[PDB]
Design a binder for this molecule. Structure first.
Ligand SMILES: [K+]
Ligand SMILES: [K+]
Ligand SMILES: [K+]
Ligand SMILES: [K+]
Ligand SMILES: [K+]
Ligand SMILES: [K+]
Ligand SMILES: [K+]
Ligand SMILES: [K+]
Ligand SMILES: [K+]
Ligand SMILES: [K+]
Ligand SMILES: [K+]
Ligand SMILES: [K+]
Ligand SMILES: [K+]
Ligand SMILES: [K+]
Ligand SMILES: [K+]
Ligand SMILES: [K+]
Ligand SMILES: [K+]
Ligand SMILES: [Mg+2]
Ligand SMILES: [Mg+2]
Length: 1333
RNA sequence: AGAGUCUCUCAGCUGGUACAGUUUUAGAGCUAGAAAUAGCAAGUUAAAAUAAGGCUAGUCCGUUAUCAACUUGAAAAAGUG
DNA sequence: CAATACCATGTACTAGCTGGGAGACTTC
DNA sequence: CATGGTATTG
């Protein structure tokens, strides 16, 4: 009998809720209170907001999981090696591997001698004197022919296997394969071969030192080009060198090309970009473009190998030894220099670990970069440091061997030294000869990504299947693991099934049948009309077939121009024809047909339908698999059909991506009477030319019937599962589930009566590192030198104007002029589509220009004149990916007619009608839970209307009727937003029931522009642009009242003024990492936690700062003093995340191990983070941990102070209304003192931070002569003192007030504990003072 | 609304791999002093751990999601104002 | 104790699938 | 970043 509606505000950290009646009033009930206190009930307003910490994604958990596997597998590699060495090492040294295992232990805990390698000090000291680094020993074992100690052989091989290098380069690799000098001359060889008239004199050019110099790519290009007179860097030879150096040269101008041949070897799409370039100028230049790829491999290896390969087979280890020797020489020189010239600074540089000198660089925590910054002025100030300063700016001064840049090293280089050492010593140790390939396999073998974890039924992540049930090793992997089935399962466990045929897997996106389907589906809706024709006609089956054979099978893309001339003129003899159903060019194309035509060069083979299954199977293999060996294995059934050259070219062709329909749907099932498949109808369908949508929905065909029969709906998801499968951030998905739980409780509160309406609004939704990468790639592709002229860091790009300055290459976007980086404050940021139409404030709709006036007119998109002169410059930014296609399309829309009136109408509509898919899902979830009954026609009975609104409706409502929000005052605005949503939503559909189609879930341009722009005017009494409306607005047809402008605004004002709002902070057990990850040094402190069971932190260091999973109230006795007399206690024990499983398995045994005796087991209270306690005078506290509290109260500032703070701070309409607001501020200037008074009384009652409050009062009394706006702006900051939750720092003007913390939880042990339901309407209060023996 | 296609873009989820960093130990400090300390020499490398750990013992698993209280119940859940 | 201060693992490469948003062609 | 852990200093 009692009718009501529900308003909801779904956020990432909050769910606001409110209940309203017919009169837009919020009810209030007496709610029973449970527990052991005086209070049996409490009065609650039916409005509030649930607060919760953000839901986290799974990414961090995944990165730690895979890192965990890599540590386990890296250890296994060492275990494999030691198992091979086991028997023979036992003869040489029967405890060598035992000393390595216990190297970490202190001598007290060591069971063997403390020197690992040899077991005595004399041999150990001699080893280090001969091999100061591991790379000295590695080089010796590679070069020497003498028999070596088996322990030194193990150390070298283990070092290579434990740190084996990356796997980014496929195939084999030998140093001196790519000598820069010998690969540069080969480039000059093949260049002068193709250009006999224009040759290059490369004599006297030291190509080795110029290209391998540790300089920037462009500088080395300029250096080499400077050595070639009459040759410019943008010429052909310069573009080849630039391609070898890794730049992005554009070969268009070299070969007078129409297509832009922009090449970069680094991209995976290169070898196709070469063939596009090779198709235009021929294959004679393939020798040239291949000689450059070789030279690039030489220059890359020259970065790693800085040593002449003709003296050693260990160029990497020799290069590390080169680091060591120059480090030794330069350190000797630096010490001698500093001792003579600056003797007083010597102790600071070489002894003080706290400083970034050499001591802090070797012993302290100073990095190479910090060390260079500390010592660069010291070298500049002294004399004789010129060579050291050169090495510093090359980042080659006093280098270590284990460094951050060693990620460049490929595993083939470590393998080369490993293989060489095995070759040297297998002559002396027979077991090395028999295990040479095994040891090499330990280094080279990696688990394929398409195989995954090698589990045996206990991994929810694994999909691998085994050919035989036995332990998988690197040597039996091919025999035990079914790589074929595993790699197939890797994709097929992720790919969609056909929704129409749920048992049929979807075709590959690049399958020939799929592209035939996409072309014929688009082609069948084309229409044409000529002179003699009465009306436009479809294309017949013969015409479509002719268009496919003549155009689609001869051109990769088919434009409309080609359709008019190459078919309608050549075949139909039409001089003029109008085409509909396609613009500019056809979207679909037969790309795979042309890919295979170039590879196999047999057009008749591709056109013969008998080969359809073979070609579909080939593309499937090329799509399913990425490993070229597995691809070759699958294609070997067709080896008899193609030459070996074609089979090799077929292997290289790989496809990714899957379509959305299955082969059985496209060309499998047949219409019963016609006997035709879907594709058959697309090829020919009389004169109806039905397409895919029409065919599967036509009742005169059997396709629709077979689709319904094939549907198989399985087990239903739970609510949580269904929400987890929604497409959205895990953060917003947390709010969605909480929203459903809130509604369930609100319905139970109303006696299981369902509401009339549910109105929902859903808020709209490192980063600087991506911005630098977007500009680096952009400027490099652009070829600009703006980063050379103006360097920048990633953090600076967070400035909106500077980020736009670089994305625009330092130029005005509307004028062909360059901008001044030091004058960005004078320039303007302009919206491409005006913000009055499109509320988009992203970089994608913004532009940096000198003056926004130059955009043209301000009521539309940039003018045609700007487009005519800036289109070429914008397209360069687009190709440089400095602007998106959408940004380019909006910038150029005026040449396509600009913003039409329909576009403006849609823009206003999209400001008010929510169309996000995630909001429709939330509406569908609530709608399906509320409406479950069906009527006589078996159609759903919609008792509950689920309405979705956008935030702009209420925010406009708040500003138009002075119901302002100030988020920093308290959390009430989340609840107030929900209330206003219910009021505005219900009143909107009451006034206009026709709008239910646009706002309720379930199944002229100037007119709609006017209509949707004036839709919210029925709330207003007068409307300028200067009409007037009645005081009472009613529905036109029903006559029912929807809004009373003399009594309903007062109701809304009373609701927003109610001080009692149910703000509930969701209590949550803390999960995640055990503690801080930092491995601290040893110290005498019980805070340290052992990193391993037997690693006493007093000897070994460890962790501290553990996270408390939840606190536990313990009432027990503890032993006291030397006598151990039992003493009754009541205290909070924080159970850490690491301790949680032990505590929950047996709580009494866990507590007794902590010291507690006679634990009152039934009085143990689980207290998660944010547990609520009430003390005296309404003061509340929340549990931050076991030893710290948070603020637990809300400051219910009266509405008059909130509205004043909004208007005074300029948180705005007609000028006279602005002056009225300005007059109201100065008339009520005394509100500033009353606001401070409200803060002071609240703070003295519940905050209890005497020093901070006195500091606040002094700061306010200090700036009383400041402007009212500035005082009001800084009063907003003061509410951080009174905000709910963790104390935080804030500054009033220029005075900073650090947070006052609640560093003790003793007082809550005698306070009242409050258990709240999700809405806080149901409470259980426990007087904890009644506990304690 | 829904569906297929084209172009661009953003996010979610899974797998494979590398480089550092840190921690303890090893890399004989010397000399003058009873010591306190001073003067000087030296430094670049390595082993091992990298969530404690778990049983299911795999070259597997261990940081996401989900969680007021109470009554049942082993739990799964349901119920309670 | 209270006030105060300091601290917090990071980078790089790479193979996929799925979904959301924007504009456009065709449809139910 | 933010805020809970930790030590230091009175
Ligand atoms: K109602
Ligand atoms: K990754
Ligand atoms: K010992
Ligand atoms: K070099
Ligand atoms: K030159
Ligand atoms: K250091
Ligand atoms: K190191
Ligand atoms: K098109
Ligand atoms: K593939
Ligand atoms: K053959
Ligand atoms: K300006
Ligand atoms: K959690
Ligand atoms: K030492
Ligand atoms: K939990
Ligand atoms: K709760
Ligand atoms: K990706
Ligand atoms: K996409
Ligand atoms: Mg481990
Ligand atoms: Mg290390």
């Amino acid at each position: 009998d009692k009718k009501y509606s529900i308003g909801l505000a779904i956020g990432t950290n909050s769910v606001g809720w409110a209940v309203i009646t017919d009169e837009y009033k919020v009810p209030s009930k007496k709610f029973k209170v449970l527990g052991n206190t005086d209070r049996h009930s409490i009065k609650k307003n039916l409005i509030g907001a649930l607060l919760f910490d953000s839901g986290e994604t799974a990414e961090a958990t995944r990165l730690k999981r895979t890192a965990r596997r890599r540590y386990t597998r890296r250890k296994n590699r060492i275990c494999y090696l030691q198992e091979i060495f086991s028997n023979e090492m036992a003869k040489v040294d029967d405890s060598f591997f035992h000393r390595l295992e216990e190297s970490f232990l202190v001598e007290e805990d060591k069971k063997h001698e403390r020197h690992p390698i040899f077991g005595n000090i004399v041999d150990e000291v001699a080893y280090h004197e001969k091999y100061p680094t591991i790379y000295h020993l590695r080089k010796k074992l590679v070069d020497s022919t003498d028999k070596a100690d088996l322990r030194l052989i193990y150390l070298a091989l283990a070092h290579m296997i434990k740190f084996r290098g990356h796997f980014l380069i496929e195939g084999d690799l030998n140093p001196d394969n790519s000598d820069v000098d010998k690969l540069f001359i080969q480039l000059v060889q093949t260049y002068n071969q193709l250009f006999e008239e224009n040759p290059i004199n490369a004599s006297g050019v030291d190509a080795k030192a110029i290209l391998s110099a540790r300089l920037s790519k462009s500088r080395r290009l300029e250096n080499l080009i400077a050595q070639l007179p009459g040759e410019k860097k943008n010429g052909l030879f310069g573009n080849l060198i630039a391609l070898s150096l890794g730049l992005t040269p554009n070969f268009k101008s070299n070969f007078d090309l129409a297509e832009d041949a922009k090449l970069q070897l680094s991209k995976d799409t290169y070898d196709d970009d070469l063939d596009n370039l090779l198709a235009q100028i021929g294959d004679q230049y393939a020798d040239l473009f291949l000689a450059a790829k070789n030279l690039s491999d030489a220059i890359l290896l020259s970065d790693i190998l800085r040593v002449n390969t003709e003296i050693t087979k260990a160029p990497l280890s020799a290069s590390m030894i080169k680091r060591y020797d120059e480090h030794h020489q330069d350190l000797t020189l630096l010490k001698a220099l500093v001792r003579q010239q600056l003797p007083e600074k010597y102790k600071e540089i070489f002894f003080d670990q706290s400083k970034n000198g050499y001591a802090g660089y070797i012993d302290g925590g100073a990095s190479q970069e910090e060390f260079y910054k500390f010592i660069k002025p010291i070298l500049e100030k002294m004399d004789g440091t010129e060579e050291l300063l050169v090495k510093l700016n090359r980042e080659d001064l006093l280098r270590k061997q284990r460094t951050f840049d060693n990620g460049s090293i490929p595993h083939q280089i470590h393998l080369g030294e490993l293989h060489a050492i095995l070759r040297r010593q297998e002559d002396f140790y027979p077991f090395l000869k028999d295990n040479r390939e095994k040891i090499e396999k330990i280094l080279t073998f990696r688990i394929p990504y398409y195989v995954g974890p090698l589990a045996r039924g206990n991994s929810r992540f694994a999909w691998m299947t085994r050919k035989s049930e036995e332990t998988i090793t690197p040597w039996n992997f091919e025999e035990v693991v079914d790589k074929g089935a595993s790699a197939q399962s890797f994709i097929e466990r992720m790919t969609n099934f056909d929704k129409n045929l749920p048992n049929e897997k979807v075709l590959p996106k690049h399958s020939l049948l799929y592209e035939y389907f996409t072309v014929y589906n688009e082609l069948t809706k084309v229409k044409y009309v000529t002179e003699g024709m009465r009306k436009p006609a479809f294309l017949s089956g013969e015409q479509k077939k002719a268009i496919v054979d003549l155009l689609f099978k001869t051109n990769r893309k088919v434009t409309v121009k080609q359709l008019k001339e190459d078919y309608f003129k050549k075949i139909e003899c039409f001089d003029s024809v109008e085409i509909s159903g396609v613009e500019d060019r056809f979207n679909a194309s037969l790309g795979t047909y042309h890919d295979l035509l170039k590879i196999i060069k047999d057009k008749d083979f591709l056109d013969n339908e008998e080969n359809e299954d073979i070609l579909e199977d080939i593309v499937l293999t090329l799509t399913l698999f990425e490993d070229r060996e597995m691809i070759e294995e699958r294609l070997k059934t067709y080896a008899h059909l193609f030459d070996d050259k074609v089979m090799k070219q077929l292997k290289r062709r790989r496809y990714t991506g899957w379509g959305r329909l299955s082969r059985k749907l496209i060309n499998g099932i047949r219409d019963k009477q016609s006997g035709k498949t879907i594709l058959d109808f697309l090829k020919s369908d009389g004169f109806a030319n039905r397409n895919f949508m029409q065919l599967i929905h036509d009742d005169s065909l059997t396709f629709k019937e077979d689709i319904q029969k094939a549907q198989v709906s399985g087990q239903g998801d739970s609510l949580h599962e269904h929400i987890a499968n929604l497409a959205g951030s895990p953060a917003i998905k947390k709010g969605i589930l909480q929203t459903v739980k809130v509604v369930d409780e609100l319905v139970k509160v109303m006696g299981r009566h369902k509401p009339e309406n549910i109105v929902i609004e859903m808020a709209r939704e490192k980063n600087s590192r991506e911005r630098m990468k977007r500009i680096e790639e952009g400027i490099k592709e652009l070829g600009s030198q703006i980063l050379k002229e103006h360097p920048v860091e990633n953090t600076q790009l967070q400035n909106e104007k500077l980020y736009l300055y670089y994305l625009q290459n330092g130029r005005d976007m509307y004028v062909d002029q360059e901008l001044d980086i030091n004058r960005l404050s004078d320039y303007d940021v302009d919206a491409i589509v005006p913000q009055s139409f499109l509320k988009d404030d992203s970089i994608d709709n913004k532009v940096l220009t000198r003056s926004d006036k130059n955009r043209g007119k301000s009521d539309n998109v940039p003018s045609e004149e700007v487009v005519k002169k800036m289109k070429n410059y914008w397209r360069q930014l687009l190709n440089a990916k400095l602007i998106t296609q959408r940004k380019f399309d909006n910038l150029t829309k005026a040449e396509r007619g600009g913003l039409s009136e329909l576009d403006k109408a849609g823009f206003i509509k999209r400001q008010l009608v929510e169309t996000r898919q995630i909001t429709k899902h939330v509406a569908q979830i609530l709608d399906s839970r509320m409406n479950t009954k069906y009527d006589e026609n078996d159609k759903l009975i919609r008792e509950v209307k689920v309405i979705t609104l956008k935030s702009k409706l209420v925010s406009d409502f708040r500003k138009d009727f002075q119901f302002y929000k100030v988020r920093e005052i308290n959390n009430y605005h989340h609840a107030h937003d929900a209330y206003l949503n219910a009021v505005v939503g219900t009143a909107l559909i009451k006034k206009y029931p026709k709008l239910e189609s646009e706002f309720v879930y379930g199944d002229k341009a100037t007119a709609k522009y006017f209509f949707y722009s004036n839709i919210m005017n029925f709330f207003k009494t007068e409307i300028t642009l200067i009409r007037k409306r009645p005081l009472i607005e009613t529905n036109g047809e029903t006559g029912e009242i929807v809004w009373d402008k003399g009594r309903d605004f007062a109701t809304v004002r009373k609701v927003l003024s109610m001080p009692q709002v149910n703000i509930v902070k969701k209590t949550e057990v803390q999960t995640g990492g055990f503690s801080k990850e930092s491995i601290l040094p040893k110290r005498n402190s019980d805070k340290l936690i052992a990193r391993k069971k037997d690693w006493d932190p007093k000897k070994y260091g460890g962790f501290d700062s553990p996270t408390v999973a939840y606190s536990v109230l313990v009432v027990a006795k503890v032993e006291k003093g030397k006598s151990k007399k039992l003493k009754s206690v009541k205290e909070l024990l924080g159970i850490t995340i690491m301790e949680r499983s032990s505590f929950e398995k047996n709580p009494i045994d866990f507590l007794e191990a902590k010291g507690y005796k006679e634990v009152k087991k039934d009085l143990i209270i689980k207290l998660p983070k944010y547990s609520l306690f009430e003390l005296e005078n309404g003061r509340k506290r929340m549990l931050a941990s076991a030893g710290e509290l948070q603020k637990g109260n809300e400051l219910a500032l009266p509405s008059k102070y909130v509205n004043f703070l909004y208007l005074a701070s300029h948180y705005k309409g007609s000028p006279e209304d602005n002056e009225q607001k300005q007059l109201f501020v100065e008339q009520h200037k005394h509100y500033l003192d009353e606001i401070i008074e409200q803060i002071s009384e609240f703070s003295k009652r519940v905050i209890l931070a005497d020093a901070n409050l006195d500091k606040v009062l002094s700061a306010y009394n200090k700036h009383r002569d400041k402007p009212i706006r500035e005082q009001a702006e800084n009063i907003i900051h003061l509410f951080t003192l009174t905000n709910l939750g963790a104390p935080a720092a804030f500054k009033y003007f220029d005075t900073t007030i650090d947070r006052k913390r609640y560093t003790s939880t003793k007082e809550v042990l005698d306070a009242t504990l409050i258990h709240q339901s999700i809405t806080g309407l149901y409470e259980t209060r426990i007087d904890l003072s009644q506990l304690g023996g």
